[PDB]
Amino acid sequence: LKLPRQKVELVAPPFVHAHEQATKQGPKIVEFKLTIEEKKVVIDEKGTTFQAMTFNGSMPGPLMVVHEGDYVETTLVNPATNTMPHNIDFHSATGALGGGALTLINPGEQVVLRWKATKTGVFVYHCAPGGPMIPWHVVSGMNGAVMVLPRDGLNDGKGHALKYDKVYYVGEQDMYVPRDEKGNFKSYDSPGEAFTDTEEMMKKLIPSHVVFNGKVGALTGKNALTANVGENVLIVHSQANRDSRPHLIGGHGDYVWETGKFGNAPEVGLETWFIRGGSAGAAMYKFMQPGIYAYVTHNLIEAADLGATAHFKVEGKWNDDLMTQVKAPAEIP
Amino acid sequence: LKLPRQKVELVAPPFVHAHEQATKQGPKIVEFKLTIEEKKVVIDEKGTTFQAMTFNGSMPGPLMVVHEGDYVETTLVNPATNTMPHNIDFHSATGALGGGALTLINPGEQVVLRWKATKTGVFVYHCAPGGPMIPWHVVSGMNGAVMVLPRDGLNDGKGHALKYDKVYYVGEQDMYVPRDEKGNFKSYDSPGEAFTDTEEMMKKLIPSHVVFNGKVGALTGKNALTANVGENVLIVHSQANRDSRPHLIGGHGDYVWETGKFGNAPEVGLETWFIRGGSAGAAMYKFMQPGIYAYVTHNLIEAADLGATAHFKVEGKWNDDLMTQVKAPAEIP
Amino acid sequence: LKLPRQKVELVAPPFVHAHEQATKQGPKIVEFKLTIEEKKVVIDEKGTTFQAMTFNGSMPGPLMVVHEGDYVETTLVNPATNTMPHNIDFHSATGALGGGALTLINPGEQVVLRWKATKTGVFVYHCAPGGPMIPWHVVSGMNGAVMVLPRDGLNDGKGHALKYDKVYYVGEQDMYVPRDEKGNFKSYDSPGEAFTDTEEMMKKLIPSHVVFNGKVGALTGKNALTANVGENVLIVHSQANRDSRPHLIGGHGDYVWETGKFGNAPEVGLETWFIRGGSAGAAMYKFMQPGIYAYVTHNLIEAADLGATAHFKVEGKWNDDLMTQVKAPAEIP
Ligand SMILES: OC[C@H]1O[C@](O)(CO)[C@@H](O)[C@@H]1O
Ligand SMILES: OC[C@H]1O[C@](O)(CO)[C@@H](O)[C@@H]1O
Ligand SMILES: OC[C@H]1O[C@](O)(CO)[C@@H](O)[C@@H]1O
Ligand SMILES: [Cu+2]
Ligand SMILES: [Cu+2]
Ligand SMILES: [Cu+2]
Ligand SMILES: [Cu+2]
Ligand SMILES: [Cu+2]
Ligand SMILES: [Cu+2]
């Protein structure tokens, strides 16, 4: 394979490495490195801990962006400081269990996989070492996404280009943290020590936490998502194990690929869309009003009580035609 | 804003206030009033009670119907006989958390919000006072829907009008009623007294009841939905917090907008469709056979055991070409 | 009704009785027989038993295949060796609760129902005897599917034929097996004896097992699904009671009707699709690589831990352009 090589410097979510939408480049070999990190992290404002397993140190793993017909060459590294075997399965890829059957590496090893990006869209990638380890590694955080853009950029299915001003990647994680007898969340010294209790809970299918970007409140405050009135924002949403129903409170999905695949035209003007577990989807919105927005899964129990709320802080001029407080709160006549 | 004003007299679900489909009217300011009522209600045939919180006294709140480009001016009233603050978030609206950030009212107050109906479809509206109160108020019953029709009425995406003879609004409600030690449903003296136990249950994500129109059996018997053979019926279905999968037993969805948005063409000939939690969808069916139909969510446990069954009673002539009992039950030869 | 009659010899899933895709036949009366069998079966590799109730002895019931405009004439037989009344509801059919209101038969009886196949797609059929028996009979295994093909075969919505080389039917079953105090699965002497404990569990909405073709591992080993590189395989997936999210690990859904209805164009290039509870869907894939594939629901806990994994074993030549192991596992430099 004698194509040009291009290195990408990955960046942590919710940001996305610089890329072109429409491009005049032809196919390349695009080189990525992912280094697995097992680590104990804090997942909520109460200080609950969690035995995480990650690509590149983050939940989700970083978004990889290429174009249709590129070859994606990933160096997967499992440092000796980890305890378990790991691999990678790309839903964008064809053959060998998405790459999983060619990438199983023990601590101290690395492997190099190349796959041709023949399918456009956003896709999950995740670890899948075999058997009961598959769900455990995924719900411990070992999942991310890849975006395979058409070379001509995105379109509306009616001949018109859809160009985003910025893209964010929201990875949603269902987490299963067991409780002790008195009802407090348990802490564990290693992923292996967490496994028995965590699997017992997993099989009951109810998460303790549902978070964006690895933690309750990760995408709020200093780390709120941002936009300006007039900006078209693409929001890629993934969930490797469990369904989600994204909703932008105060906005819409102007153009939505809920199954996440750009060979299909987007749907228009959605209130809430649906990310099937094991997939990524994408929604574009042009902001029309300034202020705070919440971006949630619209199981509101999950959103408000289990962790699944992000914010956008949007700058610009208020549009009284679109919405106005005609009369402020006042005593009932 | 110097447009004509038009008042609407809302009606309780499953009925829908009189409206035009295609219209020659231009944009108007359409005026609605919603008065919040907190009240203890009975939700099943066993006499289980429930601390409900409602718009206009009903679960769901009434369906509001306007056309694209209208301005919707809602007077939201929170009488002093209630105990909690409330607000309203319209998924149809743009800005200020759907209106929620402009409509928080204490008992004894009212507020007037106007929003421009720039997106067509059926949409959820719900209370969303902030934080953990958001899911609690929604699952206590504070949700309804609005329908924003194209000015030319509905179409099939192929150039042809789709005119309904009647429309019904089915609001589905997941309810979380705690049990005592011996396994009976608990009763509470106030919503505030119900909150701690109810939140603990909510976070476990399994409802005790799933009902249409506020109660097991609400849309059966005297209150069955009705039609005649030959009539095209539009069924709007909403679920503000949790997924549903509507199905008309003995029928189909001839034309279905499962994501609920009229900028998209309907799907045709469905058996079962999917309402993502936090959304409304709509399905049209032309009845071809008389008799009893059941309209359910097709988790049949929810439908038959947790409350989520409505009936249609349909008049007209049986069509033996479409279906016939060739041989009645008889002993096996 | 003076049309030609054609008998079909049904075959057990995942296989499908021989049929034409495009056909020059006109409408016929197509005759099927289903004989109900209640039986205790083993559902996992641990030897857990289950009080099953089945059409034709299998879970799922066999796939019935006809063409648009055919009349489907089913002899439903409830032998005296069974204990309960049963019936059949076809989601493909119009009127009388899908046929259920015309087919209730006691042990020792049979009935003959005819329905006209006016809607194309794949559809669920299931037992539905009334009230709380409806979910119980369905989750005990009394569900299958029917496929109603266009007379011109399948198409891509763009004018082009889609011809499958083979079709498989994957019926997914949520099962509710109670546990005793010490945590072992219970065994029962009859379906009636299992009912009280099984209903109590059903209402909590969490299955103990989620299986394909009636058992953990049913579609693995000797009984793996098969294909060759170059073959277009249609996979019909049904779930009569609960949502599923199919995914072919290492492949895609080239053409997918996730709502399962051929009046709608397929979506293209999916990673994971969604089968709403109470429906069947269908996905076509042309295999490009040899080796083992897993076909799962992509709640990976369900797939790996509760039973919901099938395999494909695919023969042919490996395509290094699509995927290659550039560097095998090696020590990190
Ligand atoms: O946006 C993707 C869609 O747009 C088109 O190219 C033009 O309508 C379709 O062929 C494709 O499905
Ligand atoms: O019914 C809505 C659909 O119908 C059309 O106007 C004509 O095909 C489309 O542009 C739109 O998506
Ligand atoms: O494949 C089914 C689809 O294909 C068409 O016949 C041609 O585009 C549509 O009318 C139909 O929805
Ligand atoms: Cu791993
Ligand atoms: Cu996967
Ligand atoms: Cu409220
Ligand atoms: Cu909302
Ligand atoms: Cu039965
Ligand atoms: Cu059914």
PDB file of N, CA, C and O in Angstrom, chain B residues 242 245 247 249-250 252 254 258 267-269 271-272 274 289 298-301 305 321-327 329-332, chain C residues 71 91 94-95 102 108-112 114-116 119 122 124 126 132 202 240-241 243 259 261 264 276-280:
ATOM      1  N   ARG B 242     -39.778   8.468  29.043  1.00  0.00           N
ATOM      2  CA  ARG B 242     -39.421   7.065  28.883  1.00  0.00           C
ATOM      3  C   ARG B 242     -39.960   6.573  27.556  1.00  0.00           C
ATOM      4  O   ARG B 242     -41.004   7.004  27.083  1.00  0.00           O
ATOM      5  N   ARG B 245     -43.570   1.916  22.669  1.00  0.00           N
ATOM      6  CA  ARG B 245     -43.628   1.315  21.351  1.00  0.00           C
ATOM      7  C   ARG B 245     -45.081   1.056  20.993  1.00  0.00           C
ATOM      8  O   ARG B 245     -45.588  -0.074  21.102  1.00  0.00           O
ATOM      9  N   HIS B 247     -48.660   0.281  19.230  1.00  0.00           N
ATOM     10  CA  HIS B 247     -49.149  -0.751  18.327  1.00  0.00           C
ATOM     11  C   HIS B 247     -50.673  -0.754  18.401  1.00  0.00           C
ATOM     12  O   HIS B 247     -51.231  -0.767  19.494  1.00  0.00           O
ATOM     13  N   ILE B 249     -53.601  -3.129  17.777  1.00  0.00           N
ATOM     14  CA  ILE B 249     -53.858  -4.547  17.646  1.00  0.00           C
ATOM     15  C   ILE B 249     -55.036  -4.730  16.691  1.00  0.00           C
ATOM     16  O   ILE B 249     -56.154  -4.329  16.993  1.00  0.00           O
ATOM     17  N   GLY B 250     -54.759  -5.415  15.581  1.00  0.00           N
ATOM     18  CA  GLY B 250     -55.732  -5.599  14.515  1.00  0.00           C
ATOM     19  C   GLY B 250     -55.619  -4.585  13.396  1.00  0.00           C
ATOM     20  O   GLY B 250     -56.301  -4.724  12.392  1.00  0.00           O
ATOM     21  N   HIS B 252     -52.746  -1.175  11.764  1.00  0.00           N
ATOM     22  CA  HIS B 252     -51.429  -0.786  11.353  1.00  0.00           C
ATOM     23  C   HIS B 252     -51.282   0.713  11.581  1.00  0.00           C
ATOM     24  O   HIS B 252     -52.250   1.405  11.816  1.00  0.00           O
ATOM     25  N   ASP B 254     -50.708   3.321   9.037  1.00  0.00           N
ATOM     26  CA  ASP B 254     -50.642   3.555   7.605  1.00  0.00           C
ATOM     27  C   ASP B 254     -49.576   4.579   7.245  1.00  0.00           C
ATOM     28  O   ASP B 254     -48.829   4.358   6.283  1.00  0.00           O
ATOM     29  N   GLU B 258     -42.713   8.630  13.515  1.00  0.00           N
ATOM     30  CA  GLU B 258     -42.431   8.157  14.863  1.00  0.00           C
ATOM     31  C   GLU B 258     -41.591   9.173  15.642  1.00  0.00           C
ATOM     32  O   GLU B 258     -41.826   9.306  16.825  1.00  0.00           O
ATOM     33  N   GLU B 267     -43.279   7.292   7.442  1.00  0.00           N
ATOM     34  CA  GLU B 267     -43.098   5.890   7.072  1.00  0.00           C
ATOM     35  C   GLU B 267     -44.463   5.270   6.848  1.00  0.00           C
ATOM     36  O   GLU B 267     -45.483   5.744   7.407  1.00  0.00           O
ATOM     37  N   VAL B 268     -44.499   4.187   6.068  1.00  0.00           N
ATOM     38  CA  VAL B 268     -45.780   3.554   5.724  1.00  0.00           C
ATOM     39  C   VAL B 268     -45.857   2.109   6.193  1.00  0.00           C
ATOM     40  O   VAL B 268     -44.871   1.375   6.188  1.00  0.00           O
ATOM     41  N   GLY B 269     -47.082   1.720   6.544  1.00  0.00           N
ATOM     42  CA  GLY B 269     -47.423   0.328   6.762  1.00  0.00           C
ATOM     43  C   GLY B 269     -46.742  -0.316   7.964  1.00  0.00           C
ATOM     44  O   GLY B 269     -46.363  -1.496   7.889  1.00  0.00           O
ATOM     45  N   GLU B 271     -46.147  -1.954  11.746  1.00  0.00           N
ATOM     46  CA  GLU B 271     -46.844  -2.733  12.755  1.00  0.00           C
ATOM     47  C   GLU B 271     -46.778  -2.066  14.112  1.00  0.00           C
ATOM     48  O   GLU B 271     -47.779  -1.961  14.804  1.00  0.00           O
ATOM     49  N   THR B 272     -45.571  -1.624  14.500  1.00  0.00           N
ATOM     50  CA  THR B 272     -45.277  -1.040  15.795  1.00  0.00           C
ATOM     51  C   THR B 272     -44.290   0.076  15.530  1.00  0.00           C
ATOM     52  O   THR B 272     -43.414  -0.038  14.671  1.00  0.00           O
ATOM     53  N   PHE B 274     -42.103   3.670  17.498  1.00  0.00           N
ATOM     54  CA  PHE B 274     -41.288   3.912  18.659  1.00  0.00           C
ATOM     55  C   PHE B 274     -41.313   5.397  19.004  1.00  0.00           C
ATOM     56  O   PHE B 274     -40.940   6.237  18.182  1.00  0.00           O
ATOM     57  N   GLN B 289     -61.959  -2.607   9.278  1.00  0.00           N
ATOM     58  CA  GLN B 289     -62.786  -3.620   9.908  1.00  0.00           C
ATOM     59  C   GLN B 289     -63.437  -3.068  11.169  1.00  0.00           C
ATOM     60  O   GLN B 289     -62.827  -2.299  11.916  1.00  0.00           O
ATOM     61  N   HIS B 298     -46.182  -2.036  23.059  1.00  0.00           N
ATOM     62  CA  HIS B 298     -45.954  -3.439  22.791  1.00  0.00           C
ATOM     63  C   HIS B 298     -44.787  -4.007  23.580  1.00  0.00           C
ATOM     64  O   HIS B 298     -44.191  -4.995  23.166  1.00  0.00           O
ATOM     65  N   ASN B 299     -44.470  -3.453  24.766  1.00  0.00           N
ATOM     66  CA  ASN B 299     -44.030  -4.284  25.871  1.00  0.00           C
ATOM     67  C   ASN B 299     -45.331  -4.761  26.514  1.00  0.00           C
ATOM     68  O   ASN B 299     -46.049  -3.968  27.127  1.00  0.00           O
ATOM     69  N   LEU B 300     -45.686  -6.004  26.245  1.00  0.00           N
ATOM     70  CA  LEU B 300     -47.005  -6.515  26.625  1.00  0.00           C
ATOM     71  C   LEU B 300     -47.153  -6.666  28.130  1.00  0.00           C
ATOM     72  O   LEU B 300     -48.277  -6.697  28.634  1.00  0.00           O
ATOM     73  N   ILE B 301     -46.029  -6.767  28.861  1.00  0.00           N
ATOM     74  CA  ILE B 301     -46.097  -6.733  30.301  1.00  0.00           C
ATOM     75  C   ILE B 301     -46.630  -5.352  30.725  1.00  0.00           C
ATOM     76  O   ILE B 301     -47.508  -5.227  31.585  1.00  0.00           O
ATOM     77  N   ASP B 305     -50.257  -5.676  32.239  1.00  0.00           N
ATOM     78  CA  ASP B 305     -50.040  -5.819  33.664  1.00  0.00           C
ATOM     79  C   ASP B 305     -49.755  -4.495  34.357  1.00  0.00           C
ATOM     80  O   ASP B 305     -50.019  -4.421  35.556  1.00  0.00           O
ATOM     81  N   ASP B 321     -63.062 -10.544   2.864  1.00  0.00           N
ATOM     82  CA  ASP B 321     -61.905 -10.668   1.981  1.00  0.00           C
ATOM     83  C   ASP B 321     -60.634 -10.454   2.800  1.00  0.00           C
ATOM     84  O   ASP B 321     -59.642 -11.146   2.590  1.00  0.00           O
ATOM     85  N   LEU B 322     -60.636  -9.456   3.673  1.00  0.00           N
ATOM     86  CA  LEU B 322     -59.438  -9.155   4.461  1.00  0.00           C
ATOM     87  C   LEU B 322     -59.167 -10.234   5.508  1.00  0.00           C
ATOM     88  O   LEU B 322     -57.995 -10.533   5.802  1.00  0.00           O
ATOM     89  N   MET B 323     -60.224 -10.773   6.117  1.00  0.00           N
ATOM     90  CA  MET B 323     -60.044 -11.784   7.142  1.00  0.00           C
ATOM     91  C   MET B 323     -61.309 -12.594   7.303  1.00  0.00           C
ATOM     92  O   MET B 323     -62.385 -12.013   7.319  1.00  0.00           O
ATOM     93  N   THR B 324     -61.157 -13.908   7.452  1.00  0.00           N
ATOM     94  CA  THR B 324     -62.330 -14.721   7.731  1.00  0.00           C
ATOM     95  C   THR B 324     -61.926 -15.941   8.546  1.00  0.00           C
ATOM     96  O   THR B 324     -60.843 -16.492   8.423  1.00  0.00           O
ATOM     97  N   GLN B 325     -62.861 -16.337   9.428  1.00  0.00           N
ATOM     98  CA  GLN B 325     -62.761 -17.588  10.144  1.00  0.00           C
ATOM     99  C   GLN B 325     -63.300 -18.675   9.219  1.00  0.00           C
ATOM    100  O   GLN B 325     -64.508 -18.844   9.046  1.00  0.00           O
ATOM    101  N   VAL B 326     -62.398 -19.397   8.582  1.00  0.00           N
ATOM    102  CA  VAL B 326     -62.782 -20.400   7.607  1.00  0.00           C
ATOM    103  C   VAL B 326     -63.525 -21.543   8.291  1.00  0.00           C
ATOM    104  O   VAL B 326     -64.508 -22.076   7.746  1.00  0.00           O
ATOM    105  N   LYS B 327     -62.980 -21.976   9.448  1.00  0.00           N
ATOM    106  CA  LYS B 327     -63.588 -23.036  10.232  1.00  0.00           C
ATOM    107  C   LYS B 327     -63.489 -22.637  11.687  1.00  0.00           C
ATOM    108  O   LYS B 327     -62.394 -22.401  12.188  1.00  0.00           O
ATOM    109  N   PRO B 329     -63.653 -23.074  15.827  1.00  0.00           N
ATOM    110  CA  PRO B 329     -63.047 -24.092  16.680  1.00  0.00           C
ATOM    111  C   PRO B 329     -63.849 -25.388  16.655  1.00  0.00           C
ATOM    112  O   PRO B 329     -65.069 -25.384  16.788  1.00  0.00           O
ATOM    113  N   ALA B 330     -63.130 -26.491  16.495  1.00  0.00           N
ATOM    114  CA  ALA B 330     -63.729 -27.808  16.432  1.00  0.00           C
ATOM    115  C   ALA B 330     -62.734 -28.838  16.930  1.00  0.00           C
ATOM    116  O   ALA B 330     -61.550 -28.567  17.013  1.00  0.00           O
ATOM    117  N   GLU B 331     -63.228 -30.023  17.276  1.00  0.00           N
ATOM    118  CA  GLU B 331     -62.384 -31.095  17.778  1.00  0.00           C
ATOM    119  C   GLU B 331     -61.401 -31.453  16.670  1.00  0.00           C
ATOM    120  O   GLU B 331     -61.742 -31.433  15.495  1.00  0.00           O
ATOM    121  N   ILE B 332     -60.162 -31.733  17.056  1.00  0.00           N
ATOM    122  CA  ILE B 332     -59.145 -32.169  16.114  1.00  0.00           C
ATOM    123  C   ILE B 332     -59.533 -33.509  15.521  1.00  0.00           C
ATOM    124  O   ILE B 332     -59.810 -34.447  16.287  1.00  0.00           O
TER     125      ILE B 332
ATOM    126  N   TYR C  71     -53.444 -14.915   0.199  1.00  0.00           N
ATOM    127  CA  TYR C  71     -54.279 -15.169   1.356  1.00  0.00           C
ATOM    128  C   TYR C  71     -53.576 -16.254   2.154  1.00  0.00           C
ATOM    129  O   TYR C  71     -53.241 -17.297   1.632  1.00  0.00           O
ATOM    130  N   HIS C  91     -49.537  -9.704  13.243  1.00  0.00           N
ATOM    131  CA  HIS C  91     -49.408  -8.266  13.006  1.00  0.00           C
ATOM    132  C   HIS C  91     -49.530  -7.869  11.554  1.00  0.00           C
ATOM    133  O   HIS C  91     -49.684  -6.700  11.233  1.00  0.00           O
ATOM    134  N   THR C  94     -55.399  -7.777   9.172  1.00  0.00           N
ATOM    135  CA  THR C  94     -56.302  -6.661   9.461  1.00  0.00           C
ATOM    136  C   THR C  94     -57.630  -7.192   9.997  1.00  0.00           C
ATOM    137  O   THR C  94     -58.369  -7.870   9.258  1.00  0.00           O
ATOM    138  N   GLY C  95     -57.924  -6.812  11.250  1.00  0.00           N
ATOM    139  CA  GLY C  95     -59.180  -7.146  11.895  1.00  0.00           C
ATOM    140  C   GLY C  95     -59.033  -8.154  13.030  1.00  0.00           C
ATOM    141  O   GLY C  95     -58.042  -8.871  13.165  1.00  0.00           O
ATOM    142  N   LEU C 102     -60.632 -14.598  16.696  1.00  0.00           N
ATOM    143  CA  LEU C 102     -61.247 -15.646  15.904  1.00  0.00           C
ATOM    144  C   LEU C 102     -60.545 -16.995  16.053  1.00  0.00           C
ATOM    145  O   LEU C 102     -60.969 -17.953  15.401  1.00  0.00           O
ATOM    146  N   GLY C 108     -57.480 -29.798  22.579  1.00  0.00           N
ATOM    147  CA  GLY C 108     -58.322 -30.716  21.831  1.00  0.00           C
ATOM    148  C   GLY C 108     -59.012 -30.100  20.622  1.00  0.00           C
ATOM    149  O   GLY C 108     -59.731 -30.801  19.908  1.00  0.00           O
ATOM    150  N   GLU C 109     -58.821 -28.794  20.394  1.00  0.00           N
ATOM    151  CA  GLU C 109     -59.453 -28.081  19.296  1.00  0.00           C
ATOM    152  C   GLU C 109     -58.436 -27.565  18.285  1.00  0.00           C
ATOM    153  O   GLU C 109     -57.257 -27.400  18.614  1.00  0.00           O
ATOM    154  N   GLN C 110     -58.968 -27.286  17.079  1.00  0.00           N
ATOM    155  CA  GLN C 110     -58.266 -26.558  16.048  1.00  0.00           C
ATOM    156  C   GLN C 110     -59.211 -25.571  15.394  1.00  0.00           C
ATOM    157  O   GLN C 110     -60.437 -25.659  15.586  1.00  0.00           O
ATOM    158  N   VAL C 111     -58.614 -24.611  14.685  1.00  0.00           N
ATOM    159  CA  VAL C 111     -59.344 -23.525  14.035  1.00  0.00           C
ATOM    160  C   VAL C 111     -58.607 -23.185  12.753  1.00  0.00           C
ATOM    161  O   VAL C 111     -57.397 -23.399  12.655  1.00  0.00           O
ATOM    162  N   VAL C 112     -59.332 -22.645  11.781  1.00  0.00           N
ATOM    163  CA  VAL C 112     -58.751 -22.238  10.514  1.00  0.00           C
ATOM    164  C   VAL C 112     -59.105 -20.774  10.256  1.00  0.00           C
ATOM    165  O   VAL C 112     -60.269 -20.393  10.205  1.00  0.00           O
ATOM    166  N   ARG C 114     -58.139 -17.308   7.814  1.00  0.00           N
ATOM    167  CA  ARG C 114     -57.539 -16.805   6.597  1.00  0.00           C
ATOM    168  C   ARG C 114     -57.450 -15.279   6.682  1.00  0.00           C
ATOM    169  O   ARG C 114     -58.379 -14.622   7.157  1.00  0.00           O
ATOM    170  N   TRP C 115     -56.306 -14.719   6.262  1.00  0.00           N
ATOM    171  CA  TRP C 115     -56.145 -13.269   6.205  1.00  0.00           C
ATOM    172  C   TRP C 115     -55.430 -12.920   4.903  1.00  0.00           C
ATOM    173  O   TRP C 115     -54.564 -13.652   4.430  1.00  0.00           O
ATOM    174  N   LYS C 116     -55.788 -11.772   4.350  1.00  0.00           N
ATOM    175  CA  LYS C 116     -55.185 -11.275   3.137  1.00  0.00           C
ATOM    176  C   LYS C 116     -53.927 -10.462   3.448  1.00  0.00           C
ATOM    177  O   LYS C 116     -53.939  -9.591   4.325  1.00  0.00           O
ATOM    178  N   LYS C 119     -50.151  -5.939   3.506  1.00  0.00           N
ATOM    179  CA  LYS C 119     -49.028  -5.098   3.963  1.00  0.00           C
ATOM    180  C   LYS C 119     -47.717  -5.880   3.799  1.00  0.00           C
ATOM    181  O   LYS C 119     -47.604  -7.022   4.254  1.00  0.00           O
ATOM    182  N   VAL C 122     -41.724  -7.768   7.185  1.00  0.00           N
ATOM    183  CA  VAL C 122     -41.677  -8.832   8.173  1.00  0.00           C
ATOM    184  C   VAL C 122     -42.511  -8.384   9.369  1.00  0.00           C
ATOM    185  O   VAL C 122     -42.508  -7.196   9.708  1.00  0.00           O
ATOM    186  N   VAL C 124     -44.390  -9.683  13.339  1.00  0.00           N
ATOM    187  CA  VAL C 124     -44.569 -10.654  14.404  1.00  0.00           C
ATOM    188  C   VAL C 124     -45.924 -11.341  14.302  1.00  0.00           C
ATOM    189  O   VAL C 124     -46.928 -10.724  13.951  1.00  0.00           O
ATOM    190  N   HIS C 126     -48.038 -13.833  17.333  1.00  0.00           N
ATOM    191  CA  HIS C 126     -47.899 -14.327  18.694  1.00  0.00           C
ATOM    192  C   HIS C 126     -49.248 -14.753  19.244  1.00  0.00           C
ATOM    193  O   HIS C 126     -50.289 -14.324  18.766  1.00  0.00           O
ATOM    194  N   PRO C 132     -53.854 -10.704  31.368  1.00  0.00           N
ATOM    195  CA  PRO C 132     -52.492 -11.011  31.797  1.00  0.00           C
ATOM    196  C   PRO C 132     -51.879 -12.233  31.128  1.00  0.00           C
ATOM    197  O   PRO C 132     -50.671 -12.427  31.153  1.00  0.00           O
ATOM    198  N   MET C 202     -41.868 -10.867  35.856  1.00  0.00           N
ATOM    199  CA  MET C 202     -42.151 -10.171  34.608  1.00  0.00           C
ATOM    200  C   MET C 202     -42.434  -8.714  34.899  1.00  0.00           C
ATOM    201  O   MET C 202     -41.982  -7.834  34.162  1.00  0.00           O
ATOM    202  N   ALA C 240     -41.011  -9.959  20.120  1.00  0.00           N
ATOM    203  CA  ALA C 240     -42.438  -9.703  20.321  1.00  0.00           C
ATOM    204  C   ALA C 240     -42.785  -8.885  21.554  1.00  0.00           C
ATOM    205  O   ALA C 240     -43.945  -8.491  21.644  1.00  0.00           O
ATOM    206  N   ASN C 241     -41.835  -8.665  22.463  1.00  0.00           N
ATOM    207  CA  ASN C 241     -42.166  -8.046  23.734  1.00  0.00           C
ATOM    208  C   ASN C 241     -41.203  -6.945  24.177  1.00  0.00           C
ATOM    209  O   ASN C 241     -41.554  -6.199  25.082  1.00  0.00           O
ATOM    210  N   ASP C 243     -37.450  -4.409  23.275  1.00  0.00           N
ATOM    211  CA  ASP C 243     -36.559  -3.864  22.270  1.00  0.00           C
ATOM    212  C   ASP C 243     -35.264  -4.683  22.177  1.00  0.00           C
ATOM    213  O   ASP C 243     -34.823  -5.294  23.155  1.00  0.00           O
ATOM    214  N   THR C 259     -37.707  -0.897  11.001  1.00  0.00           N
ATOM    215  CA  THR C 259     -39.114  -1.027  11.326  1.00  0.00           C
ATOM    216  C   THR C 259     -39.736  -2.165  10.518  1.00  0.00           C
ATOM    217  O   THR C 259     -40.884  -2.508  10.800  1.00  0.00           O
ATOM    218  N   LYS C 261     -40.584  -2.882   7.157  1.00  0.00           N
ATOM    219  CA  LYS C 261     -41.720  -2.782   6.257  1.00  0.00           C
ATOM    220  C   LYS C 261     -41.267  -2.306   4.881  1.00  0.00           C
ATOM    221  O   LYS C 261     -40.730  -1.213   4.734  1.00  0.00           O
ATOM    222  N   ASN C 264     -41.226   1.017   2.692  1.00  0.00           N
ATOM    223  CA  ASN C 264     -40.230   2.041   2.989  1.00  0.00           C
ATOM    224  C   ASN C 264     -38.902   1.594   2.412  1.00  0.00           C
ATOM    225  O   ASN C 264     -38.549   0.423   2.482  1.00  0.00           O
ATOM    226  N   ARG C 276     -37.940  -2.620  17.567  1.00  0.00           N
ATOM    227  CA  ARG C 276     -38.854  -2.252  18.631  1.00  0.00           C
ATOM    228  C   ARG C 276     -39.605  -3.485  19.100  1.00  0.00           C
ATOM    229  O   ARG C 276     -40.059  -4.326  18.319  1.00  0.00           O
ATOM    230  N   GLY C 277     -39.731  -3.597  20.408  1.00  0.00           N
ATOM    231  CA  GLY C 277     -40.521  -4.693  20.946  1.00  0.00           C
ATOM    232  C   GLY C 277     -41.907  -4.708  20.307  1.00  0.00           C
ATOM    233  O   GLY C 277     -42.557  -3.670  20.177  1.00  0.00           O
ATOM    234  N   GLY C 278     -42.357  -5.896  19.935  1.00  0.00           N
ATOM    235  CA  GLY C 278     -43.564  -6.065  19.134  1.00  0.00           C
ATOM    236  C   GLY C 278     -43.354  -5.914  17.650  1.00  0.00           C
ATOM    237  O   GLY C 278     -44.306  -5.570  16.937  1.00  0.00           O
ATOM    238  N   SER C 279     -42.179  -6.198  17.111  1.00  0.00           N
ATOM    239  CA  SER C 279     -41.946  -6.044  15.696  1.00  0.00           C
ATOM    240  C   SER C 279     -40.853  -6.992  15.221  1.00  0.00           C
ATOM    241  O   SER C 279     -40.091  -7.561  16.002  1.00  0.00           O
ATOM    242  N   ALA C 280     -40.816  -7.122  13.890  1.00  0.00           N
ATOM    243  CA  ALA C 280     -39.702  -7.690  13.193  1.00  0.00           C
ATOM    244  C   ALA C 280     -39.089  -6.638  12.279  1.00  0.00           C
ATOM    245  O   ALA C 280     -39.780  -5.791  11.733  1.00  0.00           O
TER     246      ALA C 280
END
